[PDB]
């Protein structure tokens, strides 16, 4: 039980690090699409 609990916590804190990367990638993609709307707008 105790090993698997320590396993799960290790896994999940890595998973959170992955999500944090996908989340920063999202913010960058938004700036890129805004890049395109800025050339159209101007």
């Amino acid at each position: 039980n105790s090993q698997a609990i320590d396993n799960l916590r290790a896994s999940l804190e890595t998973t959170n690090q992955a999500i944090e990367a996908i989340r920063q990638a999202g913010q960058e993609m938004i700036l890129a699409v805004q890049g395109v709307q800025d050339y159209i707008n101007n």
């Binding site: 999940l12 890595t14 992955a18 990638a25 993609m29 890129a32 800025d38 050339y39």
Partner: protein, 35 residues
């Protein structure tokens, strides 16, 4: 057009590098869970 172009290609570059980083981290987690 010079500014717009680079703002768009620079941001797609750092996005792409964030997405590969997340794949590294996600593969890592699948392997830790498997044990």
């Amino acid at each position: 057009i010079e500014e717009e172009r680079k703002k768009v290609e620079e941001n797609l570059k750092k996005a792409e590098e964030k997405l590969k980083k997340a794949e590294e981290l996600l593969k890592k987690s699948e392997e830790i869970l498997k044990k």
